[PDB]
A paper describes a structure:
The bacterial Rho factor is a ring-shaped motor triggering genome-wide transcription termination and R-loop dissociation. Rho is essential in many species, including in Mycobacterium tuberculosis where rho gene inactivation leads to rapid death. Yet, the M. tuberculosis Rho [MtbRho] factor displays poor NTPase and helicase activities, and resistance to the natural Rho inhibitor bicyclomycin [BCM] that remain unexplained.
Moreover, the analysis of the closed ring dataset did not permit to compute a reliable and interpretable map, while particles corresponding to the open conformation allowed us to compute a cryo-EM map at 3.3 Å resolution (which led to the structure of the hexamer in the open ring conformation), showing an open-ring organization of the complex resulting from the assembly of six MtbRho subunits. The presence of a clear electron density in all the ATPase pockets of MtbRho reveals that ATP ligands are held by a network of interactions involving the phosphate, sugar, and adenine base moieties. The adenine base is stacked on Phe530 while Thr333 and Thr361 form hydrogen bonds with the NH2 and N7 groups of adenine, respectively. These H-bonds explain the marked preference of MtbRho for purine versus pyrimidine triphosphates. However, close inspection of the BCM-binding cavity in our MtbRho structure revealed that it contains a methionine (Met495) instead of a leucine (Leu320) in EcRho. This Leu→Met substitution creates a bulk in an otherwise structurally comparable cavity, which could penalize BCM binding by steric clash.
Residue numbers in the entry:
A (entry chain E): 222 to 276, 286 to 592
B (entry chain D): 222 to 278, 286 to 592
The structure:
Amino acid sequence: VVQPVAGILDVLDNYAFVRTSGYLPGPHDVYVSMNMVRKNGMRRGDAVTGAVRVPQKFNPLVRLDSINGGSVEDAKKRPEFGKLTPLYPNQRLRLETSTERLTTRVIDLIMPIGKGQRALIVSPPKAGKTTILQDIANAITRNNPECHLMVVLVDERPEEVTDMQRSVKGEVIASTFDRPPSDHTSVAELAIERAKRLVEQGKDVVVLLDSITRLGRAYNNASPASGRILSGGVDSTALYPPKRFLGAARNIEEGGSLTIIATAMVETGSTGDTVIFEEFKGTGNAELKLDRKIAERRVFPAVDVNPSGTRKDELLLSPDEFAIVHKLRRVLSGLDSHQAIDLLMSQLRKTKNNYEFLVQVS
Amino acid sequence: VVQPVAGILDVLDNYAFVRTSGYLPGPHDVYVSMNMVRKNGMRRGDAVTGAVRVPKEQKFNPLVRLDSINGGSVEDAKKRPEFGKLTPLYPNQRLRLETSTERLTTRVIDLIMPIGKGQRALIVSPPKAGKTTILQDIANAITRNNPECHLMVVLVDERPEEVTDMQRSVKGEVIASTFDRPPSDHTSVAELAIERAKRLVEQGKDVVVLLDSITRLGRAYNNASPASGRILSGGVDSTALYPPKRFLGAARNIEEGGSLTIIATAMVETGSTGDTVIFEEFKGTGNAELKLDRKIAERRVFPAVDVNPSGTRKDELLLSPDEFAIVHKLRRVLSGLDSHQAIDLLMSQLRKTKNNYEFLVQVS
Ligand SMILES: Nc1ncnc2c1ncn2[C@@H]1O[C@H](COP(=O)(O)OP(=O)(O)OP(=O)(O)O)[C@@H](O)[C@H]1O
Ligand SMILES: Nc1ncnc2c1ncn2[C@@H]1O[C@H](COP(=O)(O)OP(=O)(O)OP(=O)(O)O)[C@@H](O)[C@H]1O
Ligand SMILES: [Mg+2]
Ligand SMILES: [Mg+2]
């Protein structure tokens, strides 16, 4: 009957819905009773292909066809929760693809991204964030196509969702600003559950969430006041769910990983953004800081070299590469940011991200 | 028998009335059942022409026949919904506003904030800054220069005299609900107006909505219902900020054809915390903003725009590359100076009988 694949979502109550075409609650969704969920071993993020009875207000979804990876009898799935989470610098996500315009060799020498990492890009508005995210998505899709890239735009203009869909080869999930914050939270939750299920399958997943601050604000505005409402306009109980999202980024010793590259808003003129970013300090191992005052000088990507780095770099780079990168970082920390970024780009102009290593050692 | 003509409003329940007022719940509105809506392919905002029975008996007499929908046919209702259609960045085609040498309101707007078919504008203005004259000038320029665009002017809380003033000074549709009406009426008027704009865009036509005081719509939404979301926002409920965002975000271009411009106005420095909170919550949503400054208006210099924080986002697709370079140079020059000096210099140089003739002067 009605075949289209869609990510199933089990709402916290007894209701479970198949979000047709994904991921927002649509007007032609299909109802799933937990009887069928339990007799089928259904998770919270599977992609079903069942049929309906064409004439719970919605369809009954009788005669399920398939699940995301296997079938009904595939009830042997390793949970994300009760599972081992190694250090996750093991495998390296290469980002160098071209030399004419870099925008990624800098954030490759400065913030080595690895599979299963939990990155965080700090950026003031109008500093070069969307270009960086698009270039990261393109580099991830081209360098290693095995990664199941997906992009989550929690709160964006409808004009920008189309641009992202056209400039990114991966899957794009987005909720426009003209949606209730409940839709924002539901989309983020369903996206992270889909990523978790793909990890349990054994595939390296990359999630390029945009504006974790907007996700935190959506969680804040969705619910009324709660414990410790006095923090700057946001209650402390509303900063748990976003962390949970950012807490999903982990490696797996058996196989697979979940990389999350979220973006944080600072200097936005709202105290809530600064508060949310401050209470997120100490969770992301790799942090990249974009500086506004460097962007107005029309030099890009305009990263803050000194406060940007990666935790546990020993397991990502090769020992000789690690030594060279350490020497470069020491040299950059010797200088101030406004000159260090200029020197780094000046050296990177004439090289190909390896000749510079050859030049640096000399 | 009687032949009402009205724009249908489809309420959440099974009721559906045609608003032959229009757009305001009147004393006599023809009732339409859901069965008629489904059979005739009706949807909220459609312009409906049909017949109705004589008084027979249900306070409102149900509709009986239908002659036309939105000017078309009952069977020709195969138009695509707006939600499912692709929404480009909408700088593709710009609406020229400079129409005469004498008036410098539209010339300044064209130089500072270019407007294209599909923008989502926001005029930020304190009280007594020159907002109504600017809206009237924009409406006149749009009607004169772009007659193909269907012009709608929505007023949410206005004096009953100002509605007539606008109706006499504006040629397009003027929908208004005066302050002597419940906030539910302002809500219904705004929602029905935007749904009508959507239904016209689905036909491929260009619609331009001139909303007045999006803050008034936000306050009407806030007062219409008891607080249920995060009340701690500055006196205004957090749930009350969603429907105004929906109204403002309905302004999308269409790749298949059409556009829906929304030049809304936001009120700041009104002495109320609700207005400032709503405006702050509406940050980063509109891609064209014009800031009117009270202190510039007090100097009796108009249109009194605050140039530096006002501009269009992604105007590269609106302007030709040489014109874009010239405008970028002008914006750099203006940003070199403070607000008062910038507007004074712009007004002083704008008296060169055209905008293009100033651009030619700008090169040399
Ligand atoms: N790699 C790059 N090379 C050159 N210019 C760039 C680069 N990345 C961004 N820019 C500049 O940045 C602008 C494009 O917008 P940008 O990517 O900065 O938006 P953003 O950071 O998403 O901003 P916002 O918060 O408004 O959405 C242009 O001025 C463009 O020249
Ligand atoms: N283009 C213009 N040229 C000259 N004077 C102008 C112009 N536009 C507005 N004004 C002046 O503005 C006044 C007209 O009212 P105005 O447009 O300022 O009201 P408003 O912004 O709607 O105010 P309110 O907040 O009371 O509704 C007059 O003093 C008129 O001279
Ligand atoms: Mg952006
Ligand atoms: Mg006025």
